[PDB]
Design an enzyme around this catalytic site. Sequence first.
Site, PDB file in Angstrom:
ATOM      1  N   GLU A   1      -4.074  -1.277  -8.490  1.00  9.03           N
ATOM      2  CA  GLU A   1      -4.738   0.015  -8.493  1.00  9.03           C
ATOM      3  C   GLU A   1      -3.641   1.047  -8.735  1.00  9.03           C
ATOM      4  OE1 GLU A   1      -8.973  -1.049  -7.439  1.00  9.03           O
ATOM      5  OE2 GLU A   1      -8.086   0.899  -7.956  1.00  9.03           O
TER       6      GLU A   1
ATOM      7  N   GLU B   1       1.190  12.234 -14.690  1.00  9.29           N
ATOM      8  CA  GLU B   1       0.586  12.392 -13.376  1.00  9.29           C
ATOM      9  C   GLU B   1       1.521  13.210 -12.484  1.00  9.29           C
ATOM     10  OE1 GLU B   1       0.244   8.880 -10.626  1.00  9.29           O
ATOM     11  OE2 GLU B   1      -1.888   9.422 -10.535  1.00  9.29           O
TER      12      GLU B   1
ATOM     13  N   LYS C   1       9.764  16.469  -7.907  1.00  8.24           N
ATOM     14  CA  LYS C   1       9.071  15.956  -9.079  1.00  8.24           C
ATOM     15  C   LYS C   1       7.973  16.929  -9.509  1.00  8.24           C
ATOM     16  CE  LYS C   1       5.374  12.640  -9.946  1.00  8.24           C
ATOM     17  NZ  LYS C   1       4.514  11.693  -9.193  1.00  8.24           N
TER      18      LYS C   1
ATOM     19  N   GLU D   1       7.196   2.908   3.129  1.00  2.00           N
ATOM     20  CA  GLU D   1       8.295   3.223   4.029  1.00  2.00           C
ATOM     21  C   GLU D   1       8.126   4.622   4.623  1.00  2.00           C
ATOM     22  OE1 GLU D   1       8.522   2.276   0.814  1.00  2.00           O
ATOM     23  OE2 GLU D   1      10.109   3.387  -0.237  1.00  2.00           O
TER      24      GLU D   1
ATOM     25  N   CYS E   1      -4.821   9.382  -6.738  1.00  2.72           N
ATOM     26  CA  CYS E   1      -4.933   8.677  -8.007  1.00  2.72           C
ATOM     27  C   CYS E   1      -6.158   9.173  -8.770  1.00  2.72           C
ATOM     28  CB  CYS E   1      -5.035   7.169  -7.787  1.00  2.72           C
ATOM     29  SG  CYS E   1      -6.591   6.621  -7.030  1.00  2.72           S
TER      30      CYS E   1
ATOM     31  N   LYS F   1       2.462  -4.734   3.637  1.00  5.61           N
ATOM     32  CA  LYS F   1       3.668  -3.924   3.669  1.00  5.61           C
ATOM     33  C   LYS F   1       3.253  -2.467   3.470  1.00  5.61           C
ATOM     34  CE  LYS F   1       6.705  -2.333   1.394  1.00  5.61           C
ATOM     35  NZ  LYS F   1       6.985  -0.873   1.406  1.00  5.61           N
ATOM     36  N   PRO F   2       3.204  -1.632   4.537  1.00  3.10           N
ATOM     37  CA  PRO F   2       2.932  -0.207   4.368  1.00  3.10           C
ATOM     38  C   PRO F   2       4.105   0.483   3.679  1.00  3.10           C
ATOM     39  CG  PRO F   2       3.547  -0.648   6.645  1.00  3.10           C
ATOM     40  CD  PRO F   2       3.434  -1.990   5.946  1.00  3.10           C
TER      41      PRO F   2
ATOM     42  N   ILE G   1       0.830  -1.189   0.000  1.00  3.99           N
ATOM     43  CA  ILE G   1       0.000   0.000   0.000  1.00  3.99           C
ATOM     44  C   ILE G   1       0.872   1.249   0.000  1.00  3.99           C
ATOM     45  CG2 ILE G   1      -1.978  -1.164   1.012  1.00  3.99           C
ATOM     46  CD1 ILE G   1      -1.202  -0.028   3.715  1.00  3.99           C
ATOM     47  N   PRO G   2       0.328   2.359  -0.541  1.00  3.69           N
ATOM     48  CA  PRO G   2       1.072   3.605  -0.714  1.00  3.69           C
ATOM     49  C   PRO G   2       1.004   4.570   0.465  1.00  3.69           C
ATOM     50  CG  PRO G   2      -1.101   3.849  -1.648  1.00  3.69           C
ATOM     51  CD  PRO G   2      -1.021   2.429  -1.133  1.00  3.69           C
TER      52      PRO G   2
HETATM   53  C1  LIG Z   1     -14.813   3.802   1.957  1.00  4.35           C
HETATM   54  C2  LIG Z   1     -15.369   4.979   1.148  1.00  4.35           C
HETATM   55  C3  LIG Z   1     -15.215   6.226   1.947  1.00  4.35           C
HETATM   56  C4  LIG Z   1     -16.246   6.579   2.838  1.00  4.35           C
HETATM   57  N1  LIG Z   1     -16.195   7.645   3.669  1.00  4.35           N
HETATM   58  C5  LIG Z   1     -15.066   8.412   3.631  1.00  4.35           C
HETATM   59  C6  LIG Z   1     -13.990   8.154   2.777  1.00  4.35           C
HETATM   60  C7  LIG Z   1     -14.077   7.057   1.915  1.00  4.35           C
HETATM   61  C8  LIG Z   1     -12.958   6.839   0.949  1.00  4.35           C
HETATM   62  O1  LIG Z   1     -12.454   5.761   0.751  1.00  4.35           O
HETATM   63  N2  LIG Z   1     -12.609   7.988   0.274  1.00  4.35           N
HETATM   64  C9  LIG Z   1     -11.616   8.211  -0.705  1.00  4.35           C
HETATM   65  C10 LIG Z   1     -11.514   9.489  -1.235  1.00  4.35           C
HETATM   66  C11 LIG Z   1     -10.601   9.765  -2.259  1.00  4.35           C
HETATM   67  C12 LIG Z   1     -10.511  11.162  -2.782  1.00  4.35           C
HETATM   68  C13 LIG Z   1      -9.791   8.751  -2.750  1.00  4.35           C
HETATM   69  C14 LIG Z   1      -9.874   7.451  -2.218  1.00  4.35           C
HETATM   70  C15 LIG Z   1     -10.771   7.175  -1.183  1.00  4.35           C
HETATM   71  C16 LIG Z   1      -9.023   6.360  -2.812  1.00  4.35           C
HETATM   72  C17 LIG Z   1      -7.690   6.894  -3.285  1.00  4.35           C
HETATM   73  C18 LIG Z   1      -7.838   8.152  -4.085  1.00  4.35           C
HETATM   74  O2  LIG Z   1      -7.073   8.461  -4.989  1.00  4.35           O
HETATM   75  N3  LIG Z   1      -8.876   8.999  -3.781  1.00  4.35           N
END
Ligand SMILES: CCc1cnccc1C(=O)Nc1cc(C)c2c(c1)CCC(=O)N2
Lengths: 493, 493
Positions: free
Chosen positions: B261, B392, B345, B188, B295, B185-186, B159-160
């Site tokens: 992902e 990106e 970057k 670093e 992302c 693995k989180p 994970i990132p």
């Molecule tokens: C579980 C859904 C949820 C519910 N309540 C709160 C938060 C979330 C949730 O996951 N949100 C969330 C918001 C954004 C902007 C992103 C991601 C996740 C994934 C990575 C990424 O690039 N963007």
Amino acid sequence: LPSPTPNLEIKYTKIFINNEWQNSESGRVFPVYNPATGEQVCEVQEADKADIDKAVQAARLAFSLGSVWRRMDASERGRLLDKLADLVERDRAVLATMESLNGGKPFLQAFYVDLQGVIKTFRYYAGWADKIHGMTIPVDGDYFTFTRHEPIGVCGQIIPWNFPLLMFAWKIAPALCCGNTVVIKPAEQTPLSALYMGALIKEAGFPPGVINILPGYGPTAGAAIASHIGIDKIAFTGSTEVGKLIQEAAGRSNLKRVTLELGGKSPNIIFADADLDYAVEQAHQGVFFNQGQCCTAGSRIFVEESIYEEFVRRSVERAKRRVVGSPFDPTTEQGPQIDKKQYNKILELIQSGVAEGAKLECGGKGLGRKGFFIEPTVFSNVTDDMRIAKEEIFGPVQEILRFKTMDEVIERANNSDFGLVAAVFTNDINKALTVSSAMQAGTVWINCYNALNAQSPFGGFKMSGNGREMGEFGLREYSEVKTVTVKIPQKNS
Amino acid sequence: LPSPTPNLEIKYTKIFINNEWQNSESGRVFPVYNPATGEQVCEVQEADKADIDKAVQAARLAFSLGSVWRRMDASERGRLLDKLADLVERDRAVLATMESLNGGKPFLQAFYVDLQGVIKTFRYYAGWADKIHGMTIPVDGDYFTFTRHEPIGVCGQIIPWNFPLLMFAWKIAPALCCGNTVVIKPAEQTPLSALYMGALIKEAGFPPGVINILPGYGPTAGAAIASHIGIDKIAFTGSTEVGKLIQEAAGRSNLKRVTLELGGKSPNIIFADADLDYAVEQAHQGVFFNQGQCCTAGSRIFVEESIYEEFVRRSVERAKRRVVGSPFDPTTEQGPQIDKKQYNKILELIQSGVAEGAKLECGGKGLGRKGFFIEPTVFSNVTDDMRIAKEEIFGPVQEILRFKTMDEVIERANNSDFGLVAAVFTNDINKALTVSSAMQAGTVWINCYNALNAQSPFGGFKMSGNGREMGEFGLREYSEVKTVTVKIPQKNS
Ligand SMILES: CCc1cnccc1C(=O)Nc1cc(C)c2c(c1)CCC(=O)N2
Ligand SMILES: CCc1cnccc1C(=O)Nc1cc(C)c2c(c1)CCC(=O)N2
């Protein structure tokens, strides 16, 4: 009973792109042989990267938004698959003859097994096309959320020589069902039935470019598909060894989606409370079917100690009477192996069995002077450390092992890098369910073997594959899921 | 409103294997920094191959037939996920403080976005565990056929650093729901909240070895996971570049199942009928949320040309007022970038935009204080061939493009190797549905941006990834399907 088509013409020997018959870009043609005689049957246009590139362009144009194939009702994609089934049924004897001549399959078995499977596969998926559903989802917040299941795009497909036409159907049916376009490469050994299907595809009325059929070799045509940056998805059936290369190539190139149907060393477990004669016949077919050239082969038969000696005796009797001969002859149970390379590999593994102290009960040698026939071979007193107990032989070689307890046999059956299929024979419901639940295998048979159906998913655990084919779940490999989330002023349940 | 935990101490700094805290095999530790100050927070035990090997062995033993985790009722797996949610809720402020300190996230946003997502993810998947169903199938022939959906086994997860705790939850929740064991693995840069979760996992009462948490570097610990022959499945979130290496490594090793992902360059399309107060704010948040380190960033905003000038004016106004500062300050909208490498970057890409003739409307420089802060930056007159339009950035850099027609903007939106998300803002139903259907993206928003929910699946088209996470479909990556086919004496419907 049906008979092989007299005076069989091989009409279709060219590359099939955009519903047109094309010469290879190089001008080369490659030979195709009869494994029963070693003699050349015909020559076929030899596809390479240049041809793959043209095919991908055709498949991409056919997939473009607003195209006939994209605009078509899902139900009409289904109708086309049903039409293809109708045409295969019409030409069943011709296609079975071709599979027999080219593939070494006994004609009656090609007619009643392979061709039945082809027809049933197309008819099954014809029914799915307009029944692929997304979902609507009661998400948190003031939104309307739904999913759209879309075709992925251009699907590259590589198939083997052991079931040429059947594997062709296994691949194109779900891909087309879902609305993809296809670039498919039959095995170099066995292109002919696939090319005939090109003629039927055109006759059925599929739009040009929806299916493109590219006969040729692995490092040329196959590698070009695997590494192509304009192909969205690859499906490969073949050896575990080549599957590794496919996955690697997908990662290195464009992260195309991958499914793999690969090899096995599948266990077949016989308890003393099984129906013995039935188990012997099923285990025999389980390893010898299709010249032993099945990823599903039950190549580790574990027999409970109290019936071991009898099981071996009956198995040897059965192998000794198994009729090896000309595929066209109705008496033939077993045809030749596909080619000299496979023939030699099988003989070397048989010698390893002898060398490592397995008991050669019968067979062990080639038959005749022409073609690639091998005696039905039975080894008993096989142990888990032996090469023949670990390596996929892909020939007419039965291996019989002994066990004492259910815990022992579960551990031994599962101690493999492979996990394609497994089986257990017992009349005890508790044993049957315990063993089947414990198997690390994608298909487990209870009191049968090699029972495949269009309705049931099929694929490997571990290094026997990634993903599933057939059934509803086969479709999951051929769609891309899109979530659409719409802001709405106010939500109610 | 909640306040950051005062004088937060980092209790958990060790490797978590078999519910025990362990030093690295090498004895090596690595530093963890605060991106707002550049100062060292603590040291953490550095996992390498040897530690991964130990973790995999623990995860394998916990997955053994007859183990506590395998025997447990599915409903009880669910109860454990719900307990973990309870504990996260209890320790919400501590965890949000940790995410702020370590990750640079404004505390209130970490509290109300990230931690909310963590809790909702666990509670959602708690409910799925005993609702994962196989099928019974009306196959041809005298058979009873059913499927078993089983956990795959040992799942490696990488994970990132941009959503440390949230991505931890996204990964372990579906894996555990399905009954797998985990080696995770989180990043670093950001191991701390993951290690705290180890403490909560033990407290919740997960059996030892079910979750193992391995802090360390990518080329060492990460590579060991990717190539491990005893790991059945890998899930990776990160750059497309590293995604390619993961798939390659899976192919070369043991054909472990892969989901990815990966990156995006996602389009956000604004038609002239959109409400500007709303659309400008949504598009602003869509690119600037989480320091631009998403992302999902809407990094290509396409605005219909009649409202383009006004949209830019409004966007520049908003960016100029955006408050950059200490993550702990409640007035802070934007914290620092994660580290110096990312900071550099981003600035290099900003420089590229200026060099290639994009109009720098505001920002464009580092803020020149301690830590890794960058001015909210807006470019207009961006064209499709510019590096900033293709690459990106993963920083606080908004890009605004003009378009005239729907046909044009669909083509331009889709002209990308990426396809993670997309959005369209219009009240016209026909345009909204035409655009959303045509997008080559895994999530399409209509009249919103960055609306994610536990109930809805998420993932990339094309080189933005393979497979889906969240919702029901997230589970499909974490189960292996077994078909069981039983011979029966006679079949009736
Ligand atoms: C579980 C859904 C949820 C519910 N309540 C709160 C938060 C979330 C949730 O996951 N949100 C969330 C918001 C954004 C902007 C992103 C991601 C996740 C994934 C990575 C990424 O690039 N963007
Ligand atoms: C469509 C199901 C079907 C129906 N009627 C007839 C045939 C089929 C069918 O496919 N059968 C079938 C039989 C065997 C022994 C194998 C395979 C397929 C796949 C490759 C392999 O190794 N073994």
